[PDB]
Amino acid sequence: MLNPIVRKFQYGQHTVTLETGMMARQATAAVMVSMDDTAVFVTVVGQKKAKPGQDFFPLTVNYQERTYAAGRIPGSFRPSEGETLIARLIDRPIRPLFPEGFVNEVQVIATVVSVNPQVNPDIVAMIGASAALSLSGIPFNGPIGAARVGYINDQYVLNPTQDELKESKLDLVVAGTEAAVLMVESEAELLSEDQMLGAVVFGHEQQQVVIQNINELVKEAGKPRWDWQPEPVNEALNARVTDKQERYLHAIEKNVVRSRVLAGEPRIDGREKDMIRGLDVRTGVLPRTHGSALFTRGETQALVTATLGTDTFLFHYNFPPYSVGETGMVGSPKRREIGHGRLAKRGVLAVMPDMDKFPYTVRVVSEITESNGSSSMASVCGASLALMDAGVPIKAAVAGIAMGLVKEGDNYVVLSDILGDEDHLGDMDFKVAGSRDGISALQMDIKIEGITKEIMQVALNQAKGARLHILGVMEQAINAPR
Amino acid sequence: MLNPIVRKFQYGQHTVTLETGMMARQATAAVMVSMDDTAVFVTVVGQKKAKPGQDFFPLTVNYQERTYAAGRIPGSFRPSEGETLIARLIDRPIRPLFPEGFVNEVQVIATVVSVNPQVNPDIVAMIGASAALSLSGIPFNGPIGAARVGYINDQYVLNPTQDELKESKLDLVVAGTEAAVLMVESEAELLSEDQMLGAVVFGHEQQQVVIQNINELVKEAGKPRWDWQPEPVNEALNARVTDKQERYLHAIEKNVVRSRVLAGEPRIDGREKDMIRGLDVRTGVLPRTHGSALFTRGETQALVTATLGTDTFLFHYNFPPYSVGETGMVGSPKRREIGHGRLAKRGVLAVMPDMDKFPYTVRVVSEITESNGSSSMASVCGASLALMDAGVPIKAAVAGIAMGLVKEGDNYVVLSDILGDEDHLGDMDFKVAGSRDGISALQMDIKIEGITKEIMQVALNQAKGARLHILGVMEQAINAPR
Amino acid sequence: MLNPIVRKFQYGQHTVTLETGMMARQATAAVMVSMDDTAVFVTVVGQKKAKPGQDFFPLTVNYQERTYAAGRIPGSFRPSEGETLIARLIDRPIRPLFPEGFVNEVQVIATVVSVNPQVNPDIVAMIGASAALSLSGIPFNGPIGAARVGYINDQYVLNPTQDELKESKLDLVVAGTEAAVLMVESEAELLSEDQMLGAVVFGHEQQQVVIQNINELVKEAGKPRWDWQPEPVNEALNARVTDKQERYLHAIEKNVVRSRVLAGEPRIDGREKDMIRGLDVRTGVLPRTHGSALFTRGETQALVTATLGTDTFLFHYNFPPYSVGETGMVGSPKRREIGHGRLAKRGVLAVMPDMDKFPYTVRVVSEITESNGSSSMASVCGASLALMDAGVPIKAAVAGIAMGLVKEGDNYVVLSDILGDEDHLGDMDFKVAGSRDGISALQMDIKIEGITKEIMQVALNQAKGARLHILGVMEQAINAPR
Amino acid sequence: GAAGGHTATHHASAAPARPQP
Amino acid sequence: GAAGGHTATHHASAAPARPQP
Amino acid sequence: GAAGGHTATHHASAAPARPQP
Ligand SMILES: [Mn+2]
Ligand SMILES: [Mn+2]
Ligand SMILES: [Mn+2]
Ligand SMILES: [Mn+2]
Ligand SMILES: [Mn+2]
Ligand SMILES: [Mn+2]
């Protein structure tokens, strides 16, 4: 006999249905999530025992859309770019919630079984993974909420439909727990810092009903929590022990950098907390392409090209191994290229001219020749210069930067233009792209609690000045498209 | 100087030519097989020495059709689904003939060099592998025969042509040695148990001339038999030592189960030898698809969907890692998905309506959410309910089951609805699919001698009742297509 | 601040620009090479430390053409066949210049950023790799030159354009250092031995200006040479210690063969220095194909087919694992198939009939059933017989052979029809294909200095007789296309 | 409206049983 | 004519600087 | 009819030989 445990709740203009304890019973947990007519079957399998010599935590999130979900039969057609991006939209918020030291293999599989053309399955899958990981018993400090925030008629809209996104000046996706925001992925039409930040708070407050309803479902049908504890801290072994290529467990060396930044001492390369690296802006680097640009920000360089033809706006991103001075594979999008490429696309999509004024298919290819701090934001700067070189009449010039944060108690330091080493060690990756008048793209990845409205407001303010500084240098080289 | 050793023989309405000892001389053996105008060049390479810490026997059968075989040049086109299925039609009968303990790496490569549009290369390749493995000297308890059995005008037809298959009510492929039948793969238009069984005996008796002619070719051109013997049985170490997920070398634990079944004691889960697991039949599970069905047979569950469009009948089969409570890859057809998918397709193809009465392209996708005993037969049950939900006017409802056999001397036990653990330990995998009036699909995989007409007749009779029981439960939910 | 070091020089009818020390600074070296409007960005990364138990030198050359280079946007489109062949045109000359014992991982990545439709990027990429490897500091006994040699109006043309190649009777690509020639890859319209050899000398003398200009660039912007030395020769362990399948560190056993050949003693299989293996020529092997041929040269056999249809001349080359008596993968072009296939294509392309006289698409597929010495040249012989079997009116019959050279001081031995074992041990791989009147294809791979005009002239003369001998046997079977 | 086993239009279930002769 | 940083039509550079308030 | 080396229409063979000067 099969017994389905069902909980329904109102979420904006939709009803979210959660079913468990019936389908896929050999999985650690499995939920059928339905937001109106769109449905995603999410499963989580966590291995009971960790492997002997495991150095990292293996988390694999698999997203897959079925053709039968829309009621279609495939023609002449390995996950697509859209499926990989949504898989990362699930992976990013859930990853830092597994306790420090947890090494067991966990796999999340989300498959779309039904889809309404107006309701996007990406939010449905994120709620499904949040429900499954909480019902499983696997140590997971959730549950998380998922909310898409629009901006129609100067007002924030919770989970706007595909038709409502046409009127919206914002496509922000926010994820986080009851305590603090974890992820943020968005695209905007040059909105101010307060408008962008207000959207993060709006979505985080609205997604609380999702967290509350998963919690109650765990109280009713949740499997007993995994009896797990990390290997105890041994003090006997702990207390006993400018250029990136020249400089680069050393947990103590990682601590020294963190303690130096909080004290107010110069950074690893010698810069201050708000200083930007050496800039080099160039236009017309390649003779046979329509537009070419070579943007350099310290030890981060991008060779960006623009091609005109007769999707209307294509963006490609290449990350070769020689950018970091290493020998790897080529052509294979290492769980990065698709993510950073769409990030750089969202930073440029706002200033792109209308098809009525400029009826041409534009493809932008970014080549990362050097990487030492956010090559995705360097691609945003390079794209703007390459489009102006090609003769593409973009509304305004666009630049991007990456921001870092080290927080200790109530003492926090906002870092401008973070390095490769400064990423791994910070508590918050913070990428802002936009023009002199607004923000086109905003990305957040937070791992700590205590991150509030004010701290994020100061972080955006220092990011705005960092953006305006590069835009000033960019204007000195080129300021108008052919 | 090259000298070809040639032996020709009559096989039905064709002449089968076997050439060896001339082409590909660095291979352990190599035959050029020609049934009339269709030719497949089959090669076998067996490694002389086994690897140090090898736990299993590595057998790889590679089938490949060349475009020049039909006299064609490729247009805009990794083995296809048809090439993978035929590779398994060669792999299945040859695998259990290698002596128990043989661990050396053996690879069979069959390439089609010529093809008659009427004579199917699949039987030609199976004879070629049978000839090559026997001439090689590699320990192989063959040779095996290969026969396609049709059913035209109430009579069995040996190796029917593609035009004769249009009139035939049967497409049975049988393989086995001189002693007993090993494999069976078929598709039928609701034929009785005696009609299906008679076809297996007919084909096995007709393919004896193939075995006799390979034997004579081995007497003339066969390489000296490999001087091989397994590592001796050490008694010093041998004599010294309901839910599937909760319960699951232990050769003794494997023996305990076998001895329990033969004695007449309840099975691992507590069922009797002819009892079927708990059934759950559902219709209309997904809101955005045309037809949906959720079929559950104990701990085996399948989410099956049906899609209508304007090959006419497509069948897709997905086996995700969460079905067994494990963490594996997704999207990659692990040497299963293609095999079980076509098996479930053949079980439903008989009841599918004519294109004159129902002119629509139908795609059926099966999602294995739980697996503990033949998820392919659960897909047959799920497809029938999904088609009736979609409004597809199938001739009759169709269900499937897997059967097992433990034989010891003359004492044998026929097992109904076998578990995942009961497969590995049984001597015969036996899958029957059909309606209340006949058999649509029948699959056999036997590893033992002494398997006769009577024992297989009792096995089918218990399978028929097992099929009728599920069909009765299926009728209680739905009995007519919209 | 970024400072580009630039050196320009005249090369034939073009100006070659080399830029370094600005882009991709974390790579061991990186050059932007531009021959007129065609540009290839070449990078080299060499690892500072070698891996513990490394047995071979890992060199990976990656060539990739960008669609934005020609100013195009991709439609509905893993490196292509053209990209893989050019990658080998870079790999072949650079590989034997790394000192004996060098085991560190080196990767060369060449990406085309701009392309003139008349100037081929393949020569540009070869100069780029030569410049990068010399500027890096990594132990590399270059720099090498790169030259394409044409033959218009009985005169040699340095780097002919795509329009000039239409008039040319030669497409020879030569690479080598200041001292000696290393590689040679060509295609010709039945040119004499002196015409082919003169082209190698012409190109090697013309490419000296490339070597001179890279040297000066190293004097100005070259990184300090890597302080590297191989593990010293230990004498304590050194002084202490017909059929191919039956016969097959043993550096002493490798030395015994080399010393035997130089002395004048019979080869491993028993042949003399100019003797050819046992030949078997057959026509009409497969009944359903248009033309079929089975060519056997000792223990090297090729099943070659020809298909007619209504690129105009397609050539496919398959190298299965059973050809050497091994068990490997199938379908995957192991860094060979594409190389040997185009080699065999270039050997047959000269005698192929005009589209005006014979307006049909011809596809030739070669199946290597046995391999023990240059299966690519056996494919040339097999193709000529298969085309004549199909009824394709080729201008003349074409055959191919592989030649070897052992040199010691001034004593050298030219080997005819080399074995698989005789390749690994020789100093020069030398493949010649052509008719009775000229040479269609010529390939060279030299690893030693002292290789001069006279020695190569004697090597071609012995190759010509070896070619005429097989052509005589080929004529005895078939001499006219249907 | 919703997806899953609970929203099924038709349903039939049976306990582990021995089939009729 | 040529490719690279040297053949650039437009150029602007700045030393590591603290942005304006 | 059949495939292989035996069904070949044309055939020519030669023992290991030294080519003519
Ligand atoms: Mn799932
Ligand atoms: Mn990061
Ligand atoms: Mn074969
Ligand atoms: Mn099985
Ligand atoms: Mn490069
Ligand atoms: Mn070679």
Beta carbons of A37 and A119 less than 8 angstroms apart: yes
Angle between helices C193-206 and C453-477 (to 10 degrees): 140
Beta carbons of A147 and A203 less than 8 angstroms apart: yes
Beta carbons of C23 and C39 less than 8 angstroms apart: no
Touch between chain F and chain B (3+ CB pairs, < 8 Å)? yes
Q: Is C165 on the interface with E (CB under 8 A)?
A: no
Q: How many CB atoms lie within 10 A of CB C227?
A: 7
CA-CA distance, C395 to C404, in Å (whole number)?
29
Mutate to test the interface with C, among E7, E11, E13 (most CBs of C within 10 A): E7
Nearest-Cα residue of chain C relative to residue A289: C71
Mutate to test the interface with A, among C15, C25, C41 (most CBs of A within 10 A): C25
Q: Which residues of B touch D2 (CB under 8 A)?
A: 287
Q: Is A208 on the interface with D (CB under 8 A)?
A: no
Report resolution (Å) to 1 decimal. 2.4
Quick one: DSSP state of residue F4?
S
Annotated binding site of C: 423, 429
Nearest-Cα residue of chain A relative to residue E3: A286
Residues in chain B: 482
- Contact across the interface for C34 and A287, Cβ inside 8 Å: yes
Element (H, E) at B209: helix B208-221
- DSSP-derived pairing of the beta strands C439-446 and C181-185: antiparallel
Q: Is D8 on the interface with B (CB under 8 A)?
A: yes
Q: Which strand ranges, in their side-by-side order, compose the sheet holding C106-114?
A: C5-11, C14-20, C29-35, C38-46, C106-114, C59-65
List CB contacts of A294: < 8 A, sequence separation 6 or more: A280, A282, A285, A301, A302, A303, A304, A382, C23, E5, E8
User: Terminal CA-to-CA distance of chain D, rounded, Å?
Assistant: 43
Phi then psi for residue A428, to 5 deg, are: -150, 120
Which of B93, B141, B137, B116 has the alpha carbon at shortest distance from B40?
B116
Beta carbons of C250 and C423 less than 8 angstroms apart: no
Q: Is C45 on the interface with A (CB under 8 A)?
A: yes
Q: What is the CA radius of gyration of chain B?
A: 23
- DSSP-derived pairing of the beta strands A411-416 and A399-408: antiparallel
Distance from CA of A279 to the nearest CA of C (A): 8
Beta bridge partners of C31: C20, C42
CA-CA distance, B276 to C190, in Å (whole number)?
77
CA-CA distance, B325 to B371, in Å (whole number)?
9
Locate B222 and state its tokens.
């066969």
Q: How many CB atoms lie within 10 A of CB A137?
A: 18
C-alpha dihedral, B10 to B12 to B15 to B18, nearest 10°: -80
- Contact across the interface for C322 and B1, Cβ inside 8 Å: no
Nearest-by-Cβ selection for A39 from D3, D6, D15: D3
Q: Is E6 on the interface with C (CB under 8 A)?
A: yes
Nearest-by-Cβ selection for A286 from C45, C74, C114: C114
The DSSP line for B102-165 is: --S-EEEEEEEEE--SSS-HHHHHHHHHHHHHHHH-S----PPEEEEEEEETTEEEES--TTTT
CA-CA distance, B32 to B8, in Å (whole number)?
12
Q: What is the CA radius of gyration of chain A?
A: 23
CA-CA distance, A417 to A277, in Å (whole number)?
7
Q: Which residues of B touch A1 (CB under 8 A)?
A: 278, 280
3-state SS, chain C, equals: CCCCEEEEEEECCEEEEEEECCCCCCCCEEEEEEECCEEEEEEEEECCCCCCCCCCCCEEEEEEECHHHCCCCCCCCCCCHHHHHHHHHHHHHHHHHCCCCCCCCEEEEEEEEECCCCCCHHHHHHHHHHHHHHHHCCCCCCCCEEEEEEEECCEEEECCCCCCCCCCCECEEEEECCCCEEEEECCECCECHHHHHHHHHHHHHHCHHHHHHHHHHHHHHCCCCCCCCCCCCCHHHHCCCCCHHHHCCCHHHHHHHHHHHHHCCCCCCCCCCCCECCEEEEECCCCCCCEEEEEEECCEEEEEEEEEECCCEEEEEECCHHHCCCCCCCCCCCCCHHHHHHHHHHHHCCCCCCCCCCCCEEEEEEEEEECCCCHHHHHHHHHHHHHHHHCCCCCCCCEEEEEEEEEECCEEEEEECCCHHHHHHCCEEEEEEECCCCEEEEEEEECCCCCCHHHHHHHHHHHHHHHHHHHHHHHHHCCCCC
Beta carbons of A159 and A11 less than 8 angstroms apart: yes
CA-CA distance, B213 to B7, in Å (whole number)?
8
| Ligand showing the shortest atom-to-Cα distance for residue C323 | 3
- The technique by which this structure was obtained is X-ray
Q: Is C8 on the interface with E (CB under 8 A)?
A: yes
Q: Which residues of B touch C317 (CB under 8 A)?
A: none
- Contact across the interface for C283 and F1, Cβ inside 8 Å: no
Beta carbons of A79 and A63 less than 8 angstroms apart: yes
Element (H, E) at A161: none
Q: Is C283 on the interface with F (CB under 8 A)?
A: yes
* Angle, vertex CA A304, rays to CA A299 and CA A307, nearest 5: 180
- Contact across the interface for A276 and E19, Cβ inside 8 Å: yes
Beta bridge partners of A378: none
Assign B293 to helix, strand or coil: strand
Q: How many CB atoms lie within 10 A of CB C2?
A: 17
Q: Which residues of C touch B113 (CB under 8 A)?
A: 286, 289, 303, 305, 367
Mutate to test the interface with B, among A113, A118, A120, A223 (most CBs of B within 10 A): A113
Q: Is B339 exposed, middle or buried (0-12, 13-18, 19+ CB in 10 A)?
A: buried
Nearest-by-Cβ selection for F10 from C277, C279, C283: C283
CA-CA distance, C257 to C200, in Å (whole number)?
30
Locate C222 and state its tokens.
């070259």
Q: Which residues of A touch B363 (CB under 8 A)?
A: 68, 73-74
| Ligand showing the shortest atom-to-Cα distance for residue A421 | 2
Assign A148 to helix, strand or coil: strand
Chains that touch B (3 or more CB pairs under 8 A): A, C, D, F
Phi then psi for residue C170, to 5 deg, are: -155, 140
| Ligand showing the shortest atom-to-Cα distance for residue C373 | 6
CA-CA distance, C165 to C149, in Å (whole number)?
10
Q: How many CB atoms lie within 10 A of CB B357?
A: 7
Locate A289 and state its tokens.
């392409």
Name the amino acid, one letter, at B337. E
Beta bridge partners of C405: C414
Rounded to the nearest angstrom, the distance between the alpha carbon of D11 and the centre of ligand 5 is 63
Place of tokens 């997806």: D3
Distance from CA of F16 to the nearest CA of C (A): 4
- Contact across the interface for F3 and B34, Cβ inside 8 Å: yes
CA-CA distance, F14 to C283, in Å (whole number)?
15
- Contact across the interface for C39 and E1, Cβ inside 8 Å: no
Rounded to the nearest angstrom, the distance between the alpha carbon of C443 and the centre of ligand 6 is 10
CA dist A178 → A132, A181, A212, A332, B20 (Å): 17, 8, 9, 37, 74
Beta carbons of B384 and B474 less than 8 angstroms apart: yes
Residues in chain D: 21
Q: Is B401 exposed, middle or buried (0-12, 13-18, 19+ CB in 10 A)?
A: buried
Quick one: DSSP state of residue F17?
B
Q: Is A294 on the interface with C (CB under 8 A)?
A: yes
Place of tokens 């991150």: A451
Distance from CA of E8 to the nearest CA of A (A): 5
Mutate to test the interface with E, among C9, C17, C22, C40 (most CBs of E within 10 A): C17
Nearest-by-Cβ selection for E19 from A284, A285, A465: A465
Q: Is B423 annotated as a binding residue?
A: yes
Q: Which strand ranges, in their side-by-side order, compose the sheet holding C313-318?
A: C313-318, C361-370, C300-309, C291-297, C279-283, F10-14
Phi then psi for residue A442, to 5 deg, are: -145, 120
Q: Is D2 on the interface with A (CB under 8 A)?
A: yes
CA dist B273 → B262, B263, B268, B454, D16 (Å): 10, 11, 11, 18, 12
CA-CA distance, C476 to D15, in Å (whole number)?
80
Place of tokens 């897997």: B402
C-alpha dihedral, A374 to A379 to A385 to A389, nearest 10°: 160
Place of tokens 């040269």: C297
CA-CA distance, A142 to A467, in Å (whole number)?
34
